[PDB]
């Protein structure tokens, strides 16, 4: 009996940390969306009607969301998926032309600059033989003064080429699930006070993640899943100012956004098959794009982050909020899509506070672009067609990407500013619950047993 023998085990519950290609899952209503619009919903496998996540009792697991792959994988999947969509969509090669632009029909005070330039230009025809002078409307940001005529050009003309998104497509973020292969598990930190790094007591295995819709947005991140108890403020290295802070809200703060102008679209035959969607007459008043949030709730929720922040910087500390320091329009402003057009909302009004140790709304203005250069584009750009009519969207704010000032001097007055830049932060914000592991079922261990002769 004293002599022990190894006996092999198949089906042993043990895993090694891994990386692997996952795959997407979506629901039937995403295909019911039809209209040939949603990206990759079609090639994407379906979800489960009765999903199950088995809780694993008595086990702890060392998570780290700042050294994860499935957010790098996702970030990549999103960039690829998007870029494959633009291949069929028409090229605006000849739209790069010397425009002759003026201001839009308006009677505004001199201080208020003109942001809608009415531009006429020699465009191409269905026939190589001919040409056509035709006019369109452009935002001031989509053009640059070229040089007593007032002539302009599309801003991309010196940086990159341009390709018009098919209107028969949609930008709506629909929920994606990242399902593992066989013999691969995803482990889910069910602890409701986890900062994203270290041992998690409450853990569960699961095939696919939750419905993670790809909202690509700077400053405040929207429509995301929110915390269960406290407003959790997560970072890789909090002490170091170079690293950003991911704030995850507890309560949703609803923010309504809109383009008040009843814009119109005309279609211009580049020919043949090619067809540019110009911006036609503005029906009605010429107003300003903007977003509203409750000053009451913003007060309330900015009070929550401060209560949490003082747990890291001292009880007797001043924590005020300031606007962006300076940089690209991509990062100096709350960027998002709304109805199919891209927004650039001044966040100075939100981040303008001060906090001591112890009924209208916030109108915040916006800008709008059509030729966009997202994901740090370099050789290619994309013209987002005019969306006919009036546009308005309603969304919750789920989080923030804040940034602290490194001047320091041990001052109890370290202030914060909204940030963005790298878009992995957004998927980092939703994927903090998850980790991918490689299943290894072949156990070997001694029990008093010999195999027969």
């Amino acid at each position: 009996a004293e002599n022990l023998w190894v006996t092999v085990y198949y089906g042993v519950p043990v895993w090694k940390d891994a990386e692997t290609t996952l795959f997407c899952a979506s629901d039937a209503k995403a295909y019911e969306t039809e209209k040939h619009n949603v990206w990759a919903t079609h090639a994407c496998v379906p979800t489960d009607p009765n999903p199950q996540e088995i809780h694993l009792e008595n086990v702890t697991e060392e998570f780290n969301m700042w050294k994860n792959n499935m957010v790098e994988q996702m970030h990549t999947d999103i960039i690829s998926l998007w870029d494959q969509s633009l291949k069929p969509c028409v090229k605006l090669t000849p739209l790069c032309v010397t425009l002759q632009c003026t201001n839009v029909t308006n009677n505004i005070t001199d201080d208020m600059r003109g942001e809608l330039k009415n531009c006429s230009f020699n465009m191409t025809t269905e026939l190589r033989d001919k040409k056509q002078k035709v006019y369109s409307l452009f935002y001031r940001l989509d053009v640059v003064q070229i040089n007593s005529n007032k002539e302009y050009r599309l801003i991309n003309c010196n940086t990159s080429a341009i390709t018009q998104a098919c209107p028969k497509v949609s930008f709506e973020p629909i929920p994606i699930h990242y399902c593992a292969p066989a013999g691969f598990a995803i482990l889910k930190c069910k602890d409701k006070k986890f900062n994203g790094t270290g041992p998690c007591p409450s853990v569960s295995t699961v095939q696919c993640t939750h419905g993670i819709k790809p909202v690509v947005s700077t400053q405040l991140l929207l429509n995301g899943s929110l915390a269960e108890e406290e407003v959790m403020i997560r970072s890789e290295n909090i002490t170091n100012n170079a690293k950003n802070i991911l704030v995850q809200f507890n309560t949703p703060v609803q923010i309504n956004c809109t383009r008040p102008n009843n814009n119109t679209r005309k279609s211009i035959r580049i020919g043949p098959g090619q067809a540019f969607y110009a911006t036609g007459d503005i029906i009605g008043d010429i107003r300003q794009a903007h977003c509203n949030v409750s000053k009451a709730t913003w007060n309330e929720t900015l009070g929550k982050v401060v209560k949490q922040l003082r747990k890291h910087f001292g009880n007797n500390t001043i924590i005020r909020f300031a606007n962006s320091s300076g940089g690209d329009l991509e990062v100096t402003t709350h960027s998002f899509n709304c109805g199919g057009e891209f927004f650039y909302c001044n966040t100075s009004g939100l981040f303008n506070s001060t906090w001591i140790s112890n009924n209208d709304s916030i109108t915040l203005p916006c800008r709008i672009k059509q030729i966009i250069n997202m994901w740090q584009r370099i050789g290619q750009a994309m013209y987002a067609p005019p969306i006919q009519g009036v546009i308005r969207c309603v969304s919750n704010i789920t989080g923030l990407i804040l940034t602290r000032d490194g001047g320091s001097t041990n001052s109890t007055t370290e202030t914060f500013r909204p940030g963005g830049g790298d878009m992995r932060d957004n998927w980092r914000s939703e994927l903090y619950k998850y980790k991918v592991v490689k299943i290894e079922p072949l156990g070997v261990a001694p029990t008093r047993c010999k195999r027969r002769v």
């Binding site: 190894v6 290609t21 013999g183």
Partner: protein, 126 residues
């Protein structure tokens, strides 16, 4: 009782050696996205077959629990029976024996073919 796939993670190696057919079960069945699906579909059978490969080059195609003829080198663990089967968990246990698992496998490989080369001689004379 039925816990679920991996449910006996933090269970003792004795209790976890009950639910083996559950981890062994959910292990096979369950154009951008299209390629992801394909190199995940092969990865799962490659990874699966590599285990059946081992069980087969040993005598343990049964399988689950399979005894053998290579005796336990105390150097590998040296712990008593109770304190691994009624105490430790496989997550834990794996990291101890991890240093020699491939050396242990080699002992198994020779031992099986040795059985076959022998058993032919038995059926040969009888």
């Amino acid at each position: 009782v039925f816990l679920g796939f991996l449910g006996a993670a933090g269970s003792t190696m004795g209790a976890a050696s009950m639910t083996l057919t559950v981890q062994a079960r959910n292990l096979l069945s369950g154009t951008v996205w299209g390629i992801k699906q394909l190199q995940a579909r092969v990865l799962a059978v490659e990874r699966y077959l590599r285990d059946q490969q081992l069980l087969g080059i040993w005598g343990c195609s049964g399988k689950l629990i399979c005894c053998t003829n290579v005796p336990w080198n105390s150097s590998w663990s040296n712990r008593n029976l109770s304190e691994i089967w009624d105490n430790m968990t496989w997550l834990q246990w794996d990291k101890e024996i991890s240093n020699y698992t491939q050396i242990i496998y080699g002992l198994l490989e020779e031992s099986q073919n040795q059985q076959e080369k022998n058993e032919q001689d038995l059926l040969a004379l009888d």
